[PDB]
């Protein structure tokens, strides 16, 4: 009865790969902000 | 020299660099290191890097070492190997930084990347500040920033102070000595100039542009009041209207209500306001009340 | 101890107090070189035989020290000039004040 | 001598070297070594290296030994066997370094590699700093850095201060005494020169270039204020506009609002500002308020 | 004598030697030996070597013995049997080394090999340092270093200070009195000379080279400030621009803002800076502020 | 007894204590040369008639 396939409570992926960030613009500044929310 | 003193070039800007370091060689005027654990922690880190591993459980009570923050400006078009000045400021319970030496300090940017390496001897004045100093050529640039200078046929001159009249005047001045359509104003603060394609060509063009002289046009009437320092500054375009002013312990020299003569130029304004015999602390309140009433025909800013 | 003018005086009265910024000072408030800063986490302050100032704290089996109390030794103690407020200064006599850690 | 005093050569730069050492021979003015365990630990390391193994459980209470940090500059094109000056700074609770001797100290780079070996006698001034000294020719270079000098046909002169006019002026000066296309400006801070292929040829070319004299062009108007030392410095291109200044305890010598005459050159500015009778501490606030209002036609920098 | 005073020969360099020893014969001014266990441990080692085995459990409380570190320079082309000077520095809680005698001390190199043996009488000045002395001819060289001198047809002269103009000038001077292609500059700091194959031939060639006189060319403008000793030194190539200087308690002798006249040569600079009536402590801050503003046309170094 | 400065003193107070590294010391913390290191696993210390 413990061998019956079951759906977990927290479905899906339990990890997220950090997304690489945008390439800085060529404006002469060190501060570069990604697409602001 | 007017255009360079009035505007700035697009993309030619200074960044800010920050880092943490240690200052050694102080005459017993460093951190207590019992209330600033980071000083001893970073000293132990430096020793461990250099090849000395001090035991974890031990008491170090230093007196010649201070933990400091170093700040600098990354200049436009900085190339690796050049030197810049840095400012060294103590961070915890240090008495002085008189004759200390800044050890190797990496100056990070906003992106937390090392753009300069700082190390040198601090110069402290000697009523002078003791926990703050400056090192001339104390940091060497290690990273360069890519730029778009030399690409495209447009360059923006950004006015330091926004003014439609001044923007139009710079546009007309560039378009008088450099061709018909060499400049177009985009807003109250930006003048777009057409530059030849290339890198040295734009350098030559901007060298020509920068030293041109423009006739500065009347620029708003404003009275700046600094209450924290107790100072008042009025520019030339400040005027007055005839109205009566009363304030404590001030009287006609004979009642307490003194008539202030309408005034057209700045000399008239100064004479009329000095006729009241008002201390600048009283003069600030007088100016604020007159701005409320409407006698003062200027923009009152409190800085 | 350090006089307000900036010149050093010498005292034998052993009554000291921690002021509002640590620092062991005399009863008159004059600072007691070579500067001794006491932390606020102190549970007990111990001044040792050799002038070692150790401070015990909470959650730290090992007492945290603070500094050394150095004594000044002169060659003619009769010769110091009595300023008044329990302070002696080096006159032409009793010159060359020799600093030393207590015990040696 | 203008080009050498204004620019620097690409790849000809100074690095920073750091190391840890011991200073011996002090007259009882070294570390307490009870609050600085690294002093005794490194002394025991030195003895163990030299052939003396002191027991682990023992009390060493030294008075003539101080643990110090040594800093130096690795000069351009340094060759092994040459000597450089070092700066020796105490690191923990040491009273003085008057007549101490620096023992063998390896000066590491940023890459944690030994580039110099330091050992010598410290010179301490004798209000002078006691925990900081300098040793002339105190370190010998042990490692050399590869370089690309002599390879390629381009050399960059990097201006110390960015200026399109100055870059163009250096470009035109190099292109007057050294051929038509011998220099091209790349940005406000870089001038690219074409050099012959080879090593001695580039040395000769740069020797010619460096001593050339360029006519320095007007360079921005700026007022530098150092509040920590209480100093104000104004260059020649600073001007003023007519406006009224009021500040505490300052009066016309008769009200408190003093008119400052418009000013074209620096002598006029100095006379107008001295007419106020202002202490430099007051003058800093006056200049800041005038910059806010707009009378001061210069760039106010606080250093 | 210019070439010898300006350059150094490749491979002709001085090394650093270090060793540990005991100084005996002091008038009760040695180590306490209760806080410096290595003194008694090494004395027992010496006695055991000499044939006296002191019991392990015993109390030795000496007063005429001090543990010292000896430092020396290994000279170029040193041969065994020659003598060098050594510096003797006390290592732990010793009062003085007035009339002590240095016992047999092996001076090790970086490679931990004995290159010299040191033993002699210390000369201590007698405000003089008591724990540091010097022994002239106190060490005898015991090991020699192989060298490549006399092999090959190239010899590098390494300039003490890097300069393309000076390197080119030395190259042209060697190539005037010693043939057409006798020297070629490799970088700003190295001049490669072609020497005959052999050992005495190169000695003769370098003897000729070393005493030649070269006309020193203008060498950068720099202001050296030593804040730890409070000294300022300006070389001949330092200039000034006209600008106004204000600092605390300094006034025209009548406001606080003093105009500094543009200055071309060093005498003009000295007169202009003395017109301010500034103490060197104030002069350091003035120079730093002027370097920030741009009046000071020199390289400000803080040593 | 060995004083901290290294000189030897003499006492008739026989009240001794083991310090944190073994060792018999006086109640004031001064060590009792000739030195005596007491091991950790000690079940009993015995001082005999002949000082052993």
Q: Which of D38, D248, D299 sits opposite B54 (nearest CB)?
A: D38
Residue in this structure with the two tokens 């400000």, named with its chain if needed: E300
CA–CA min distance E86, chain D (Å): 11
Q: Are C62 and B34 within 8 A, CB to CB? A: no
Q: Are F5 and C49 within 8 A, CB to CB? A: no
Q: Which of E89, E255, E294 sits opposite D277 (nearest CB)?
A: E255
Is residue B174 classed as helix, strand or coil in its secondary structure? helix
Give Cβ neighbours of residue D27 (< 8 Å, ≥ 6 apart): D64, D96, D98, D99, E129, E130, E131
In chain B, which residue's Cα lies nearest the Cα of E303? Answer: B121
In chain B, which residue's Cα lies nearest the Cα of A33? Answer: B111
Identify the sign of the CA torsion B132, B137, B140, B141: positive
Using a threshold of 3 CB pairs under 8 A, tell whether chains B and C touch.
yes
CA distance C19 to C40: 11
Q: Are E289 and D274 within 8 A, CB to CB? A: no
- Helix residue ranges, H only, chain E: 2-6, 37-50, 164-177, 200-210, 266-275, 280-293
Token pair for E282 = 């104030």
Q: Which residues are D155's β-sheet partners?
A: D193
Cα-based angle E12, E13, E19 (whole degrees, multiple of 5): 140
Chains touching B by CB (3 or more pairs below 8 Å): A, C, D, E
Give Cβ neighbours of residue A1 (< 8 Å, ≥ 6 apart): none
CA–CA min distance B126, chain E (Å): 7
Token pair for C86 = 């329990």
Which residue, B91, B86, B90, B88, is CA-closest to B72? B86
Identify the sign of the CA torsion D92, D95, D96, D102: negative
CA distance E50 to E101: 18
Which residue, C35, E69, B133, B43, is CA-closest to D89? B43
Q: What are φ and ψ of residue D292, in 5° steps?
A: -65, -45
Which residue, C13, C61, C58, is CA-closest to C39? C58
In chain D, which residue's Cα lies nearest the Cα of E285? Answer: D229
Q: Any chain C CB within 8 A of the CB of F4? A: yes
Q: Are C67 and B35 within 8 A, CB to CB? A: no
D100-to-B43, D43, D73, D122, E229 alpha-carbon distances in Å: 23, 15, 22, 6, 17
Q: Is D221 exposed, middle or buried (0-12, 13-18, 19+ CB in 10 A)?
A: buried
Longest dimension (CA), chain E: 84
Q: Is D112 exposed, middle or buried (0-12, 13-18, 19+ CB in 10 A)?
A: exposed
First and final CA of chain A: distance in angstroms? 49
The 10 Å Cβ neighbour count of residue B59 is 18
Query: How does DSSP assign D173-215, residue by residue?
Result: HHHHHS-TTSEEE-SSSEEEEE--SSSHHHHHHHHHHHT----
Which residue, D244, D283, D260, D291, is CA-closest to B283? D244
In chain D, which residue's Cα lies nearest the Cα of C66? Answer: D35
Q: Are D32 and C68 within 8 A, CB to CB? A: yes
CA–CA min distance C79, chain B (Å): 31
CA distance B206 to B195: 9
Contact B244, B256 (CB under 8 A): no
Contact E157, E182 (CB under 8 A): no
Q: Which residues are D99's β-sheet partners?
A: none
Disruptive mutation site among F4, F6, F27, F29 for chain C (greatest number of C CBs within 10 Å): F4
Residues of E with CB under 8 A from a CB of F: 32-35, 57, 59, 61
b/e D8-36 (16+ beta carbons within 10 angstroms → b): bbbbbbbbbbbbbbbbbbbbbbbbbbbbb
Question: Listing from the earlier edge strand, what are the strands of the sheet with D231-234?
Answer: D299-302, D222-226, D231-234, E243-247, E257-260
Contact D56, D112 (CB under 8 A): no
Antiparallel, parallel or unpaired: β D101-108 and D83-90: unpaired
Report chain F residues whose CB lies below 8 A from the CB of C49: 4
Return left, alpha or beta for E21; rule: phi > 0 is left, psi -120 to 50 is alpha, else beta: beta
Residue in this structure with the two tokens 């009241």, named with its chain if needed: B276
Q: Are B111 and A30 within 8 A, CB to CB? A: yes
Helix (H) or strand (E) holding C3: none
Residues in chain C: 104
Return left, alpha or beta for D44; rule: phi > 0 is left, psi -120 to 50 is alpha, else beta: alpha
Chains touching A by CB (3 or more pairs below 8 Å): B
Q: Any chain C CB within 8 A of the CB of F5? A: yes
What 3 state SS string does F1-52 have? CECCCCCECCCCCCCEEEEECEEEEECCCCECCCCCCCCCCCCCCCCCCCCC
The reported resolution of this PDB entry, expressed in Å, is 7.4
Token pair for D79 = 């060759």
Contact B244, B294 (CB under 8 A): no
The 10 Å Cβ neighbour count of residue B36 is 20
CA–CA min distance B109, chain A (Å): 6
Residues of B with CB under 8 A from a CB of A: 11-13, 15-17, 74, 76-77, 109-111, 113, 115, 145-149
Q: Which of E89, E165, E258 sits opposite D101 (nearest CB)?
A: E89
Report chain B residues whose CB lies below 8 A from the CB of C66: 34, 61
Residues of C with CB under 8 A from a CB of D: 52, 65, 67-68
CA distance D269 to E154: 62
Q: What are φ and ψ of residue B213, in 5° steps?
A: -110, 130
Token pair for D120 = 């010598």
Q: Are B111 and A26 within 8 A, CB to CB? A: no
Specify the experimental method: cryo-EM
Report chain B residues whose CB lies below 8 A from the CB of A31: 15, 109-111
Return left, alpha or beta for B228; rule: phi > 0 is left, psi -120 to 50 is alpha, else beta: alpha
What 3 state SS string does E230-249 have? CEEEECCCCEECCEEEEECC
Residue in this structure with the two tokens 């017109």, named with its chain if needed: E275
Q: Are B34 and C39 within 8 A, CB to CB? A: yes
Q: At what angle do helices E164-177 and D200-210 cross, to 10 degrees?
A: 120
Residue E145 CA neighbour count, 13 Å, CB half: 20
Token pair for E259 = 């105009």
Which residue, B293, B213, B219, B290, is CA-closest to D293? B219
Contact D164, E128 (CB under 8 A): no
Using a threshold of 3 CB pairs under 8 A, tell whether chains F and B touch.
no
Cα-based angle E278, D224, E275 (whole degrees, multiple of 5): 25
Disruptive mutation site among E31, E34, E35, E60 for chain F (greatest number of F CBs within 10 Å): E34
The 10 Å Cβ neighbour count of residue E47 is 12
Q: Are D36 and B62 within 8 A, CB to CB? A: yes
């Amino acid at each position: 009865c413990a061998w019956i396939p079951a759906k977990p409570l927290v479905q899906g992926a339990t990890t997220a790969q950090p997304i690489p960030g945008p390439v800085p613009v060529a404006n002469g500044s060190i501060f570069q902000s990604a697409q602001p929310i | 020299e007017r255009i360079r003193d009035l505007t700035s070039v697009q993309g030619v800007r200074e960044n800010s660099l920050i880092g943490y370091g240690l200052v050694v060689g102080l005459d017993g005027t460093g951190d207590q290191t019992t209330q600033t654990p980071f000083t001893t922690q970073t000293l132990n880190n430096m020793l461990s890097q250099l090849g000395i591993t001090v035991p974890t459980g031990t008491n170090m009570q230093l007196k010649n070492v201070a933990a400091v923050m170093v700040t600098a400006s990354y200049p436009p078009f900085a190339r690796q190997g050049q030197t810049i000045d840095v400012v060294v400021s103590s961070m915890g319970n240090a008495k002085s930084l008189r004759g200390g030496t800044l050890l190797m300090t990496p100056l990070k940017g906003v992106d937390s990347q090392v753009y300069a390496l700082a190390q040198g001897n601090i110069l402290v004045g000697g009523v002078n500040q003791l926990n703050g100093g400056r090192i001339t050529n104390g940091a060497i640039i290690e990273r360069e920033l890519p730029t778009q200078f030399g690409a495209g046929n447009t360059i923006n001159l950004q006015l330091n102070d926004e003014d439609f009249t001044m923007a139009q005047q710079i546009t007309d001045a560039i378009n008088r000595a450099r061709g018909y359509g060499s400049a177009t104003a985009l807003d109250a603060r930006t003048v777009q100039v057409r530059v030849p394609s290339g890198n040295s060509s734009q350098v030559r063009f901007l060298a020509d542009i920068q030293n041109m002289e423009v006739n500065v046009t009347p620029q708003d009437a404003k009275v700046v009041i600094n209450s924290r320092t107790g100072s008042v500054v009025m520019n030339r375009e400040v005027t007055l209207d005839s109205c009566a002013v009363a304030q404590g312990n001030l009287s006609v020299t004979g009642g307490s209500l003194q008539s202030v003569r309408s005034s057209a130029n700045l000399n008239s304004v100064v004479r009329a306001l000095n006729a009241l015999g008002a201390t600048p602390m009283d003069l600030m309140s007088i100016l604020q009340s007159m701005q409320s009433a409407g006698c003062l025909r200027a923009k009152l800013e409190i800085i | 101890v350090m006089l307000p003018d900036g010149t050093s005086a010498y005292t034998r009265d052993g009554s000291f107090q921690v002021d509002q910024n640590g620092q062991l000072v005399t009863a008159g408030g004059f600072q007691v070189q070579p500067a001794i800063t006491i932390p606020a986490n102190a549970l007990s302050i111990t001044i040792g035989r050799d002038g070692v100032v150790s401070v015990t704290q909470q959650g730290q089996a090992a007492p945290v020290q603070v500094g050394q109390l150095n004594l000044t030794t002169f060659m003619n103690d009769t010769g110091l000039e009595s300023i008044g407020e329990n302070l002696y200064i080096e006159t032409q006599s009793s010159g060359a004040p020799n600093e030393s850690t207590p015990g040696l």
